[PDB]
Amino acid sequence: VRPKVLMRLSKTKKHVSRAYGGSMCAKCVRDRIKRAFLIEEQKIVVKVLKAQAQSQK
Amino acid sequence: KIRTSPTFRRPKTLRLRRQPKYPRKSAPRRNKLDHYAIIKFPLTTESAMKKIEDNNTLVFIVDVKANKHQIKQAVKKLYDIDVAKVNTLIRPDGEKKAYVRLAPDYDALDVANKIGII
Amino acid sequence: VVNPLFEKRPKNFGIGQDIQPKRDLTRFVKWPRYIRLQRQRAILYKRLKVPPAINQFTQVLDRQTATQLLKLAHKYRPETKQEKKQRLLARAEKKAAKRPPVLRAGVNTVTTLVENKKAQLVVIAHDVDPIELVVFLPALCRKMGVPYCILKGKARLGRLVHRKTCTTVAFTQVNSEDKGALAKLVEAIRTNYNDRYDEIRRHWGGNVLGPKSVARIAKLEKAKAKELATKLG
Amino acid sequence: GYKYIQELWRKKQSDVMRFLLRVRCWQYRQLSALHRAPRPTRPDKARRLGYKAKQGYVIYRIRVRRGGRKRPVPKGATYGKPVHHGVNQLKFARSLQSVA
Amino acid sequence: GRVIRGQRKGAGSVFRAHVKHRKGAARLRAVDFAERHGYIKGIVKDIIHDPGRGAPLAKVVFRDPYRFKKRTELFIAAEGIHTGQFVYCGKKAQLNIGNVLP
RNA sequence: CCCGGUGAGGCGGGGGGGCGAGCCGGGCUCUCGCUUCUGGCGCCAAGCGCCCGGCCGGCCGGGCGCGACCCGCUCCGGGG
RNA sequence: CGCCGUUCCGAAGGGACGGGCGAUGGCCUCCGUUGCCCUCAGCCGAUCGAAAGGGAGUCGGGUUCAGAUCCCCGAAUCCG
Ligand SMILES: [Mg+2]
Ligand SMILES: [Mg+2]
Ligand SMILES: [Mg+2]
Numbered sequence: 030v031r032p033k034v035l036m037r038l039s040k041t042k043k044h045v046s047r048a049y050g051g052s053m054c055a056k057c058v059r060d061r062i063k064r065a066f067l068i069e070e071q072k073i074v075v076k077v078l079k080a081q082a083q084s085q086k
Numbered sequence: 087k088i089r090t091s092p093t094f095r096r097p098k099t100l101r102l103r104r105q106p107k108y109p110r111k112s113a114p115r116r117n118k119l120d121h122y123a124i125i126k127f128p129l130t131t132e133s134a135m136k137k138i139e140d141n142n143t144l145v146f147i148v149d150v151k152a153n154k155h156q157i158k159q160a161v162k163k164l165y166d167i168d169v170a171k172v173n174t175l176i177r178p179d180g181e182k183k184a185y186v187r188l189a190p191d192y193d194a195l196d197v198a199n200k201i202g203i204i
Numbered sequence: 205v206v207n208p209l210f211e212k213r214p215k216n217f218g219i220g221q222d223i224q225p226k227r228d229l230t231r232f233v234k235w236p237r238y239i240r241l242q243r244q245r246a247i248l249y250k251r252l253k254v255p256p257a258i259n260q261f262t263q264v265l266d267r268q269t270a271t272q273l274l275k276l277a278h279k280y281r282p283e284t285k286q287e288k289k290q291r292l293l294a295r296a297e298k299k300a301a302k303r304p305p306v307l308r309a310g311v312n313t314v315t316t317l318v319e320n321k322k323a324q325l326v327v328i329a330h331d332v333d334p335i336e337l338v339v340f341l342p343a344l345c346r347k348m349g350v351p352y353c354i355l356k357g358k359a360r361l362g363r364l365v366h367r368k369t370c371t372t373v374a375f376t377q378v379n380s381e382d383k384g385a386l387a388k389l390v391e392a393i394r395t396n397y398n399d400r401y402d403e404i405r406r407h408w409g410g411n412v413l414g415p416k417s418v419a420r421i422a423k424l425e426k427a428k429a430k431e432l433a434t435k436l437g
Numbered sequence: 438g439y440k441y442i443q444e445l446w447r448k449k450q451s452d453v454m455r456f457l458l459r460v461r462c463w464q465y466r467q468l469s470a471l472h473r474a475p476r477p478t479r480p481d482k483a484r485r486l487g488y489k490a491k492q493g494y495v496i497y498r499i500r501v502r503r504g505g506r507k508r509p510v511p512k513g514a515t516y517g518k519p520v521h522h523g524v525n526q527l528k529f530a531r532s533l534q535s536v537a
Numbered sequence: 538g539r540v541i542r543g544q545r546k547g548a549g550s551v552f553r554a555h556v557k558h559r560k561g562a563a564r565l566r567a568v569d570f571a572e573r574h575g576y577i578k579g580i581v582k583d584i585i586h587d588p589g590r591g592a593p594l595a596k597v598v599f600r601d602p603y604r605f606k607k608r609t610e611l612f613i614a615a616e617g618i619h620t621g622q623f624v625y626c627g628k629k630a631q632l633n634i635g636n637v638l639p
Numbered sequence: 640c641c642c643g644g645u646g647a648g649g650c651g652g653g654g655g656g657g658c659g660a661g662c663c664g665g666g667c668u669c670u671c672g673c674u675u676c677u678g679g680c681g682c683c684a685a686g687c688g689c690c691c692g693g694c695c696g697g698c699c700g701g702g703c704g705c706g707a708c709c710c711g712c713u714c715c716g717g718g719g
Numbered sequence: 720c721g722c723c724g725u726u727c728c729g730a731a732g733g734g735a736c737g738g739g740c741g742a743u744g745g746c747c748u749c750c751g752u753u754g755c756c757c758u759c760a761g762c763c764g765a766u767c768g769a770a771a772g773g774g775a776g777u778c779g780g781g782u783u784c785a786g787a788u789c790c791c792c793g794a795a796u797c798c799g
């Protein structure tokens with residue numbers, strides 16, 4: 030609908046019930062949850078491999 | 087008190103209110119848009135007599151500076167008649183014709199009989 | 205007894221790591237024009253070679269002599285506005301049924317009685333806005349042999365009299381009892397202002413570069429000093 | 438006293454008065470072009486010119502750009518006889534003090 | 538004689554640039570503490586065609602190191618830039634394409 | 640006096656921490672002080688110390704320091 | 720006289736939530752009011768510029784010598 034018609038509709042008519050609902054597509058949602066968990070995981074691997082180096086050296 | 091932001095904004099000071107020592111004008115000017123000046127005279131033309139008879143309205147030549155609110159609240163003062171709606175229009179003559187439509191129970195033809203126009 | 209929920213969450217304020225905290229920036233603020241003006245005029249008074257006639261106002265009375273000075277200059281304050289009326293009344297009933305020695309205020313009067321040699325001690329405010337009003341008083345005192353001294357603050361010199369600011373103050377005469385304190389001050393003053401007038405009339409002030417640009421020269425000089433300190437062996 | 442500031446303000450080529458007039462001129466060059474001063478800069482010259490230190494007397498400081506009066510005309514083209522081809526080296530008939 | 542066409546260009550009003558549909562002045566990122574002692578990482582949101590200009594522009598997007606905000610910047614796109622690419626800026630930035638460093 | 644930039648945002652010294660040249664645990668030369676696999680998130684304080692304030696050491700609710708080194712005379716630079 | 724200038728040499732915000740203090744009107748209970756601090760706040764330039772650009776929301780039938788999405792009837796609709 031036109032922008033100023035959105036004040037008339039109810040929230041359920043304007044968003045789908047999902048994380049980032051009605052402001053991002055599902056494919057790019059899942060493909061962002063993935064990258065988030067993966068990058069924080071590699072940051073944990075590197076955190077480990079940091080003190081693993083500092084232990085010997 | 088550390089300066090967290092590098093923009094010195096002007097501090098807000100205190101602002102008093104006018105406590106004059108004498109009113110400029112002595113007396114408040116009387117309201118020259120009276121309930122009487124706001125309604126000059128009616129119309130007695132068969133373009134408005136068919137409105138009175140059929141549409142149960144009245145046609146007044148009101149002051150040009152008058153709102154539909156002032157008109158409603160000044161016919162409910164000069165004539166004591168609740169009003170359905172008001173439709174104004176400025177004629178090419180210059181005056182502001184106003185079609186006032188009375189409540190369902192009130193009869194225009196029978197309040198124009200009263201006030202004179204009939 | 206410790207609760208296993210209250211974790212310790214440290215932040216990393218490294219480059220690009222996390223948003224810098226609400227630090228203090230009173231150094232980098234963009235100030236209003238009047239503030240920056242007076243703040244860098246105080247700097248021009250450190251960069252410009254100040255002639256000794258203006259530089260002779262920085263060498264001022266100390267903080268211990270100042271107290272005793274204003275202690276003596278509190279027994280000889282002028283009369284108030286109310287004391288003036290109450291003296292006109294006590295003079296009225298005096299008529300019905302000498303002037304005490306007091307202070308003396310103002311340049312036009314201090315100069316005109318330093319020429320008349322009437323003064324016994326002159327106090328001069330160190331921060332007269334247009335300094336031309338007291339540029340000459342130092343030399344006129346030294347010339348007449350009047351003990352003068354510069355005091356820090358014309359807003360503390362202005363509380364002796366009952367006005368906003370005063371410029372100079374003069375002790376012409378004092379009572380008997382306070383003549384000893386006056387002679388115990390005139391000594392420590394004349395030995396500090398009139399005795400060393402030769403070295404006061406010669407001492408230029410100012411002419412000192414900002415620390416940011418004196419450290420860039422002390423560093424280079426250090427490098428060329430430790431050069432001869434290290435190349436000799 | 439006033440004659441001391443008077444005879445002092447005549448040695449403008451000295452050291453002290455060329456330091457004072459220069460820090461004054463620098464500070465003035467930073468303020469607005471026309472601003473009210475709190476008090477008369479020269480109290481002696483102000484008395485001499487009629488300034489009684491009482492309410493109602495006001496001192497405005499004002500700066501004006503030095504130099505002559507270039508003629509306000511197009512590019513060159515002051516249409517007239519060669520007598521009045523002068524634009525550059527002209528002078529104004531009222532002093533810069535009267536313009537202040 | 539008439540003011541010649543060369544002279545009529547310094548006044549303007551006809552000879553002014555057509556800056557209607559242009560996207561903004563393509564300028565580098567201002568110098569801050571990060572850009573002066575480390576490196577700051579941003580992404581490439583898109584590469585647009587600015588009118589009246591042969592080069593393309595690139596919306597590089599950083600995040601303010603002092604506020605909670607995503608700053609946009611209009612660079613000129615070096616060749617090999619693509620979208621979703623990471624561009625670093627500052628003294629400690631590595632030396633590859635699109636990587637502004639002193 | 641001029642120029643450029645910015646919401647004039649960490650400038651200059653000094654201290655504190657780590658790496659290597661070295662002398663025999665202690666002083667110097669150095670440098671760094673925490674972000675490079677990805678089209679993700681990132682503020683509005685965790686924590687420790689100190690104090691206070693009401694109801695019954697126990698509930699409730701505030702403030703200060705560290706966290707986030709100290710000291711400084713131009714906002715930083717470039718001209719001059 | 721004025722002209723230049725529209726972010727440029729500027730102390731350019733009179734606003735908001737919460738808290739504390741103070742007052743007020745009444746089921747003076749509980750909200751509302753306005754006074755004082757505390758906390759927070761970016762902006763980007765006053766204002767003007769389109770009856771063809773952007774811009775929520777009305778249609779049927781009847782009616783006048785001349786007016787109808789405007790009056791009458793009947794059906795709706797937006798905003799507060
Ligand atoms: Mg008033
Ligand atoms: Mg204009
Ligand atoms: Mg408008």
Ligand SMILES: [Mg+2]
Pocket residue numbers: none
């Ligand atoms: Mg329109």
